[PDB]
Amino acid sequence: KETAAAKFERQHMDSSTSAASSSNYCNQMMKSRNLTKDRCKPVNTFVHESLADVQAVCSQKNVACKNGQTNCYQSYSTMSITDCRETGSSKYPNCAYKTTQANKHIIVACEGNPYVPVHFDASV
Instruction: Residue 72: give its domain's CATH number.
Output: 3.10.130.10
Burial tier of 102 (Cβ tally within 10 Å: 0-12, 13-18, 19+): middle
Q: Are 97 and 35 in contact (CB under 8 A)?
A: no
- Please report, in angstroms and rounded to a whole number, the separation of the first and last CA atoms in the chain: 31
Q: Annotation-wise, does 104 bind a ligand?
A: no
Report the alpha-carbon distance of residue 107 to residue 124 in Å, rounded.
8
Q: Annotation-wise, does 42 bind a ligand?
A: yes
How many domains in the chain? 1
Which residues are annotated as catalytic?
Answer: 12, 119
Report the alpha-carbon distance of residue 28 to residue 81 in Å, rounded.
16
Strand, coil or helix: 17: coil
This structure's resolution (Å) is 1.5
Residue-number span of the structural domain to which 44 is assigned:
1-124
Q: Annotation-wise, does 7 bind a ligand?
A: yes
Alpha helices in the chain (DSSP H): 4-12, 25-32, 51-55
As a dihedral over the C-alpha atoms of residue 93, residue 94, residue 95, residue 99, rounded to 10 degrees, the angle is: 160
Q: How was this model experimentally determined?
A: X-ray
